[PDB]
Each structure stands twice: as C-alpha cells, then as structure tokens.
Assembly symmetry: C3
Homo-oligomer: 301 residues x 3
C-alpha cells in the first residue's frame, strides 16, 4: 500500500499521469469517490490547503473531516501511533499538515489509510504537482521538458522542485544565498535521477544566473512559519523578484508563487500584480491535482 | 453585472418581498435547488446562530458549507483581503462573511468571482432583517403590505437595516433611542429619499412610549453592541427608560409581537416576563433565518451576469 | 420523547437491542436516516468521539454540524434554555459532550430534538455501549452474562459500567483505592437493579480480588479531565493499581483488556500489556461507530 509523502516515491510516468488526470477532471468532473472519507489533520492551519482538499474529496462524491490544531493536539497528549490506529482505521484517506516530517512517517507507519503530505518541513509535493499542472496549462512545457528557475530558501519547496525536476527531466536552476545549503541526501537522489531522465540541474547563489534562459520562475516567502527574522531578510538582499529580474528570463515567462506573498520582499507589488492571473490560477489548480492524487491512492491499496 | 448581498439598500421593494415569498414556499415545500453548490463561510467573530442558518441553508438546498473560522482565517492580519478573495472567491459558489468592518466585505466583493453575503457588519445586518420580515408576515402583522413597526434600541447595525428596509418597503416605522444618540447621516439621508418613493412614514425620537403608539411589531436588541463591549457600563445607564417590559408592550397595539435577534439580556433591553411571554414568536424568528438565507442563496445563484 | 443521557433510563432489552442493531449495521450498512441532521456540541474537545458521531450520522445518510468550544460558549453567554430552543428546533438530534451533567438535563428539558450524552462527569454511556459491542464480538459473552472487572477511579466510566452490569445481569467486580467512594445514589440504583437481573456486583480496594475469574478487564486513566489541578496526589494513591502482565495473569486465560483511551503507559497500564491487547483496544475504539448508529436510529423511532 502506497502513501503520498513525497514525489520521490513516484515515477516520471506516475507523476505525469496525475497531471493528465487532473486535467481530465478539470475538464469533465466526475464523482469517482462516492461516499469516501478524508480526515484532514492540521498542526498548523492553512486555509488555502484546506480548501483544496476539502473541495477535492467533496466534488469527487466524498466527505471531509477537518480536525484542527485546537481539536487535535498531536504528540502533546496521546502518542501518534495511537491516533493513527484509530483515525487511520475509520476513514479512507488521511491528509496531514505537519510541523515535522517524522510525524507523518510515524502516522503512516500505523495508518491503515493512505496518508497524504499536505506540507512538511522537508517536502511540499502537492504544491509542486499544482505548479506543474499550471506550467502545462500555460503551455510552458515545450518538448515534455520545462526550463525552470527556483529562487528562495533551501526549504521544503526547493527540495520538492529539485526532486521533481530530476524525475521529470526538467532543466532547473536553483538560487539561494551563499551561506544556505541543500540536504546532501536529497541532492544525491536527484543526481541519480537526472542521469536516468536527462535533467539539467544547477545550484547557485546568483539570482540572475539562475534566471537566464528560463520560461518559469518560481519563488516563495523567505520568513517561513514557525521560523520567525530581521537578520534573515538582510541575507536575502539581492533576491527579490522584480521587473529587472523577470527581464533576465525569457520573454513571456510566468511567475509562480505558492503564497502568501509579501510584497516588497520576495516579490515586488508591480511584478506580482503583473502575474496575478497565473499566480491565482496556480492557487486554485491545487484542487484538480489533489483530486487526481486521491483517485490514484484509492486504486493503490 | 453580478450582484452581491451586502445590504438591503441595493434591492427593490419587489426584490425583498419576493425573497420573503420564496422563503415561505421553501418552508412549506423544501427543494434541493442548489445541488453540489458550495458556500464558504468566513467568520471574523463567531456566531453559532448564524452559522447554523447558513450551514443548514446550503445543506438542505443540496450543497456543502465550508466553515473557515477566526483561528483558521486571519483576515487583514496576515495576507491582504484581495488575495484571499482571489483564491476563495474563485473556488466556491458563494461566500458568506461575518466581519468586524464593512469595508472588508466591500474589498472582498470587489475581488470575488463569487457573490459575497453580509452575515453581519458594523453597519448592516440584512439577513436578520429578512428573517424578521418573514416572521412578521407569518404572524399576520402585515396588513396591506405595510407594517406598523417600532424599533427600540441603539443606533447599531440592526437599526440601520430596519430603517432602510422600512424605507424601501413603505412601512411605518418609529425609532426610539437615547437623546445623545444619532443615526449616521448618510444612512438617514438614503432613508429619507426612499420614503418619498415608497410612502414610508419614518419618525425618530428619544421617547420609548411615543415610538410604541399604534404599533403591531416591537423590535429591540442588545444595547452593548458586539465589539463595543469595552464601553458597556456607561451605555447601560444611558438606556435607563428603554427596556421593553409589560407596561411598554401595553402601549402598543393589542396582540403586538415582540422581536429580538438574540441573544437577549433579561433585565436590560427586555424583561424576563415579557421575553418569555413572546418565546413562541422570538424563537420562530430565530429559526426563520434558515428559510430566508435559502431564498437569498437561490436568488444570488440566478443573478451571476 | 426519549433522550439518551444514561443507560439508567433503559431496559436490559433495550440495551441489548441497540448492540444487536449495531451489529446488523456493521454487517450490512444501510442509510436509514436520509437527510437527517446532528448537531454536535462540545464543551471540551474529543476527536475520537467526534469521529464516531460524525461518521455515524454521515453513513446513515445525514449531516453533522460540529459546534466547538470556541464556537459555542454554553452557560457563559446566553442561557442554555435559549440555546436549546434554537438549536434543538433546527436539527434532528443533538449530541453533547459536557463538563457538567446538569447542562445536558437543562438542554434536554428545552430541546425539541433528542439529546445524546457523549460524555459527562457522571456518565459515559456511549462508551459502555461500545465496550459491550466489543465484548460480544470477542465471544466473551457466555450465556448472555459477562464476567467483568473494572479497575480505576470512581469516575463516569465506573458509574456507567456499574449501572450497565446491574441492568444486564453481568458479574462485575470493581476495584479502586481505599479512600475512594462511589456516589451513594448511583450505588443504590445498582443494588436495586441487581436484585431484578441477578447481577453479581462487588466493590473492593484489591486489584487482584477484582480480577479473579474474569474474562474482561476494563481500566481507565486515573487523572480524569478537569481534575488535573490535583494530579500529583492521585498518582500516589493508585500505587498498586496498574494493569500489568502479573495482573492479567490473575484473570482467566485469554481475557481481553479494554481501555477507553487515551492511555498513559506506565500508569494505569503497562506498555507491554497495552500493546499485547492493541487489536481489541483499537477495535473497541472503532466500534463506537456502530453503536452510535444504532442509538441514532433508535432515538429517531422514539419521538
């Protein structure tokens, strides 16, 4: 039985078929999960995420249960294996948004129901799936390859993009400040994968180098939740995405941001609003992708 | 152009009355008119009574509600409202919002692909007034399409929305509040203008008993209006003569009904005796918000372009 | 019109038929409450409980409304009769998990809709029903009787096990520390009921005596919620009372251990023994679903 904790556990073919299914569903919605149930466990609230999941299962014919931070104190009252052995036995799927990946792993270990990583400090795979869906929608996938730049932290988003690029065969440039490092274990996995898929990966500390010859620019907040700051902002001096920065990329390149955005920091107001349409489709598109993911996990029991 | 429901000011006599009639049809013969449709409910300050009405309204109509709470959703505290609007408003069919500040509703509506519904703001509480109206009609206190109504209380949202609705509908309304208290001039002007068209007999005073003369419907509300709770002790003293009690109801017409949006504070704006004397109507009032939100949601579904 | 506030208000026959119905429903699920609604009022959150009820009504064809602690402040803003007379008139059932039983009573008194006691300081009947379901599933009900030991506090669980054993005709031994007493009013009810049903009830302060010739051992947390301002003292009082391997050894062969959860390994129960019984303890947990289903269908017919 398969969980969905990271795209690392999936094939190029599997990932692409999730995006194609999403697309079919967006076009022609079907109630493929009649009466199925999804428990949603949040350790830290995210309205954007919740919407995506709640609506995903709902539209597919099922029901969602929202168990919040207040509602559900994980590893703070009862142990996780206990919670897993009750909740994971009563519902068809469990999504979790967690502070720490270990928690997902520990839950999955004892969950009869497939567990979905709605966000952890290591990986944010649903988001990348949505980003991907969006790239395809905006016809920025020439030749099954995408030429992508990621600018920001060595955070979860970076990890997941690095990985996915590696699996899919994308050309990706990553840019973060000089003092910032990427996990050697993750990096190794990507190196291996690139060999098989022909990925052109590069990692640096120069925004403008990363941006050269790119059709898709991806950025993210610098001050990550919980990790709140004043010193960090000063470290990300050159790193804002602005008009001059987008100029360096290819003509008509799209800007993606997972949100929320902090105008005047990782992104300028002008440039952000310049790309409202794509940024907010991006936000919404997580729906179609979670749908696909849920149908998929339902068939891999 | 697509219509939101932020205040009754934006609607015609005919429109409001047809919402009530529809509510009534639905109460008689429930129908699932919004199959699969979705309603985001955003609360900035929790109201269980409201939530019930909306949740059940859409549910019974065949749809699904999403409750996003205060804890869940921090508006204008993290991300700007236009950003939220451009996500949430794009994914759901309707968005209801209970807000601290009306501007927030306006700003959201401005960016929402989905019709936004004012579940309560500091200026207006229209879904409540619709329910009050429904109730007045059910209790056969709308002789001649007109109603003879007294509103006693603060210059709060409820007052505004009664003033307005009276104005649109052509009702005869007397408002009573303390001497120092005023109604927003902008709102008052609208009402003056609307009365001309509709023949509303509107009067504002500071004498409970005058307001009450020849009335079939007495409406009151809490004095310490929500949020303004840092100022309560003072407000109470100002509302000395203003409680609705047996003697006060005596001044109104025979068999006049007492309406209160709830919750009620026995011993303040209303006496225990009198409140309980009207439990049947008051609690039907409570419940009747359901049918009215149903109508409203059907109505906004049909007015998308 | 009948509410479900304690098993005290039901007959042996009524209780057994709830368990039987549950069992039918587990076997063959049916949507017997199409479109019906359940308001769930929590004064203190319990995820385990919520799941049970939310899924019960949902699977039965209805809808749940979760009103939380933050959402709904009971007897702290508006009076309860007012709440009851709004909520209880818009939904088909009301479950409540409350700090104080009186609150259920007061609500029920003004609720058009049947109220269900999802847990109070006095009684936890839905849990006992589930326990019962589970005992029957693990074939530990020889001759319609069960031989049961309850070890723990004089809490809600104890009250409800005492009562139910009394109604049903079970043989039950209860063990708690010396200083601890059962509510005389509850105890007196049980005494009376045992006479009618032939219950073999005994109360002591000796874990091992309680355990002798038992097929079911039941335990529970010692630090009961709310009473957390007094904990350090309580733990010391419960020295001999943990359920461990040696304790289970005293009971009959293949005897099952039940715990309503959550559990505090190293206290009322040892890690080893708890995990030894994971399968039954977690079926126990899950089985609350089928029983709440039964209960809801039952209350739908007793209007």
């Amino acid at each position: 039985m398969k969980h969905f904790l990271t795209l690392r556990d999936f094939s190029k073919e599997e990932i692409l078929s999730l995006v194609n299914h999403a697309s079919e569903l967006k076009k022609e919605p079907k109630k493929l999960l009649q009466d199925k149930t999804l428990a949603m466990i949040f350790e830290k609230n995210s309205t954007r995420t919740r919407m995506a999941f709640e609506l995903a299962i709902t539209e597919l014919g099922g029901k969602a249960l929202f168990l919040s931070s207040n509602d559900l104190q994980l590893s703070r009252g009862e142990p996780v294996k206990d919670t897993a052995r009750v909740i994971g036995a009563m519902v068809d799927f469990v999504m979790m948004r967690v502070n720490k990946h270990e928690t997902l792993l520990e839950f999955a270990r004892y969950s009869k129901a497939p567990v979905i990583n709605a966000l952890s400090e290591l990986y944010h795979p649903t988001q990348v799936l949505g980003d991907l869906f969006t790239i395809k929608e905006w016809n920025k996938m020439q030749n099954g390859i995408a030429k992508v730049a990621f600018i920001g932290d060595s955070n979860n988003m970076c990890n997941s993009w690095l990985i996915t690029a590696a699996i899919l065969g994308f050309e990706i440039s990553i840019a973060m400040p000089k003092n910032y490092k990427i996990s050697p274990e993750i990096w190794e996995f990507a190196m291996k994968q690139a060999l098989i898929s022909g990925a052109k990966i590069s990692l640096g500390y120069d925004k403008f180098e990363a941006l050269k010859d790119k059709d898709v620019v991806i950025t993210d907040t610098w001050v990550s939740m919980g990790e709140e700051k004043e010193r960090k902002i000063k470290e990300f001096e050159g790193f804002m995405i602005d008009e001059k920065a987008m100029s360096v990329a290819n003509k008509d390149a799209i800007l993606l941001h997972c949100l929320p955005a902090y105008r005047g920091y990782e992104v300028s107001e002008e440039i952000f609003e310049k790309h409202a349409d794509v940024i907010f489709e991006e936000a919404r598109n997580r729906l179609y992708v979670v749908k696909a993911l849920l149908c998929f996990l339902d068939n891999q029991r």
